[PDB]
Amino acid sequence: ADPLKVMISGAPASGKGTQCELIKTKYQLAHISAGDLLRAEIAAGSENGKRAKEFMEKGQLVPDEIVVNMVKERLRQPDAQENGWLLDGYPRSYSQAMALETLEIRPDTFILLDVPDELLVERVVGRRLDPVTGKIYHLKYSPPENEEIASRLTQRFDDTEEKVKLRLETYYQNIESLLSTYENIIVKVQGDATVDAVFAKIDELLGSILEKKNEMVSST
Amino acid sequence: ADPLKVMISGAPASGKGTQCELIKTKYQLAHISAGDLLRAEIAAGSENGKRAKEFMEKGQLVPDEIVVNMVKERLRQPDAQENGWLLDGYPRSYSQAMALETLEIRPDTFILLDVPDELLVERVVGRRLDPVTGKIYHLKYSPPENEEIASRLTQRFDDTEEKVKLRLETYYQNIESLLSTYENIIVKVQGDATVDAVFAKIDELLGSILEKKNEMVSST
Ligand SMILES: Nc1ncnc2c1ncn2[C@@H]1O[C@H](COP(=O)(O)OP(=O)(O)OP(=O)(O)OP(=O)(O)OP(=O)(O)OC[C@H]2O[C@@H](n3cnc4c(N)ncnc43)[C@H](O)[C@@H]2O)[C@@H](O)[C@H]1O
Numbered sequence: 416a417d418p419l420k421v422m423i424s425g426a427p428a429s430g431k432g433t434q435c436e437l438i439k440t441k442y443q444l445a446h447i448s449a450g451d452l453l454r455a456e457i458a459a460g461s462e463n464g465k466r467a468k469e470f471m472e473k474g475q476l477v478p479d480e481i482v483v484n485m486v487k488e489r490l491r492q493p494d495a496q497e498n499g500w501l502l503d504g505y506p507r508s509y510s511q512a513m514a515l516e517t518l519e520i521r522p523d524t525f526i527l528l529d530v531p532d533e534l535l536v537e538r539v540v541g542r543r544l545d546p547v548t549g550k551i552y553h554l555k556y557s558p559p560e561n562e563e564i565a566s567r568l569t570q571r572f573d574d575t576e577e578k579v580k581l582r583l584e585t586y587y588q589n590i591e592s593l594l595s596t597y598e599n600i601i602v603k604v605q606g607d608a609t610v611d612a613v614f615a616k617i618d619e620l621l622g623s624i625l626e627k628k629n630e631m632v633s634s635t
Numbered sequence: 636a637d638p639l640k641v642m643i644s645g646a647p648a649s650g651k652g653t654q655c656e657l658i659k660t661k662y663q664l665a666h667i668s669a670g671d672l673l674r675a676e677i678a679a680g681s682e683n684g685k686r687a688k689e690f691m692e693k694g695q696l697v698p699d700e701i702v703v704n705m706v707k708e709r710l711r712q713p714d715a716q717e718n719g720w721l722l723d724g725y726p727r728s729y730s731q732a733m734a735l736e737t738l739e740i741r742p743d744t745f746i747l748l749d750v751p752d753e754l755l756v757e758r759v760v761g762r763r764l765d766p767v768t769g770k771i772y773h774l775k776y777s778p779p780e781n782e783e784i785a786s787r788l789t790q791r792f793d794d795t796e797e798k799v800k801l802r803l804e805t806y807y808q809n810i811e812s813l814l815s816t817y818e819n820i821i822v823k824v825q826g827d828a829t830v831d832a833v834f835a836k837i838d839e840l841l842g843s844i845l846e847k848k849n850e851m852v853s854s855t
Pocket residue numbers: 425426427428429430431432433434449450451453470471474475476477478482504505506507511538539541542543551552553556557582606607608609610613
């Protein structure tokens with residue numbers, strides 16, 4: 416509808432979660448995230464959680480019945496319809512993408528983070544997470560702000576160096592169908608650069624899209 | 636009582652979980668484990684779990700009301716009283732140790748794993764865990780048996796290189812009171828050696844203790 420609606424995706428450890436924080440904090444959008452929702456169910460320890468976890472341990476995609484409608488109902492909440500939605504890690508397969516088209520849910524732009532596979536490994540092996548806040552960190556690039564935060568940092572069960580090669584396969588194998596799907600409003604953004612350097616680009620993009628929509632609104 | 640009852644402890648990543656598997660499988664004892672029980676409650680996602688986790692994230696000791704009786708009731712089960720019990724990671728403080736003495740619960744021997752702090756770090760940074768089985772692994776020493784097991788290995792949220800220094804403090808600071816407590820039947824076992832090399836020692840120890848107890852049984 417008229418509120419801004421974005422959709423982001425990319426290979427694992429490219430900067431999806433990191434960028435979304437910046438976008439969210441400024442634009443005030445409702446940040447949805449297929450990855451986080453999955454982990455939340457696991458955290459709660461439900462049957463869906465202990466089911467989903469299995470696929471995530473082998474680097475597999477969690478089956479549609481869990482994901483598709485879990486996302487569905489999050490979009491039904493008011494904030495997403497009034498302020499705007501920001502998808503993250505969805506869709507990830509033809510069927511998933513198609514599910515949304517049948518409900519007339521199409522974004523304004525599709526941002527893909529392009530990162531060379533050679534980089535990824537070291538990005539993930541140093542990634543940390545502060546549970547009390549939710550802020551992403553990295554021991555070298557973007558380290559903790561020398562606070563007690565350093566003592567409360569943790570890591571995901573699936574950030575094993577060798578897991579990466581596996582999660583890469585599932586990735587590019589499926590994105591071929593995605594690009595095909597009416598998502599051709601794809602804006603490829605180079606990820607091999609400063610966290611600030613990348614954001615600036617995504618900001619400028621969203622900024623102009625606001626002008627476009629607003630121009631028609633001001634039909635004089 | 637007459638069934639064998641052991642109690643093991645040591646600094647983090649010394650080999651407590653690893654050895655217990657060998658002991659358990661051979662001697663047929665009921666293996667209790669304060670660490671595992673805590674993680675199980677978190678896995679289940681209860682109020683106790685989300686409470687306990689906090690302390691475990693900063694490398695703190697979980698408060699007595701959660702631990703003390705959680706262990707209490709596990710010892711009440713039949714198998715522990717009929718076959719024998721094998722404590723692991725308990726007690727860890729004066730109060731905890733004392734709780735057991737008030738119920739006439741005393742072990743046969745107290746095995747302490749002596750490992751030089753200089754080693755520990757690399758032991759923990761390469762530790763993996765197969766969820767489907769519960770077998771401990773390490774990427775270099777005792778690697779996975781070249782099976783699909785390699786694809787389903789995970790890691791704990793608290794195996795951060797820098798966390799180690801913290802968990803070391805809490806450790807030796809409290810063991811001073813433990814040694815003091817009537818636990819002087821301490822058998823120090825050098826941990827800087829092959830997994831088989833260490834086990835052999837623990838086996839021979841338990842083996843003789845069986846002879847001792849059995850001798851009196853055969854009062855001729
Ligand atoms: N739709 C769906 N269908 C089915 N199953 C689904 C599903 N969605 C999820 N799942 C499943 O759930 C599992 C987990 O998925 P998910 O948790 O979504 O993981 P992922 O997609 O693999 O991605 P990450 O979250 O690891 O990476 P990121 O790109 O967001 O990186 P970040 O910004 O943190 O950054 C990573 C690191 O790089 C850093 N960093 C960021 N930008 C830069 C930069 N420019 N330079 C240097 N460092 C940087 C950070 O500090 C950090 O250290 C999957 O395995 C799958 O099973």
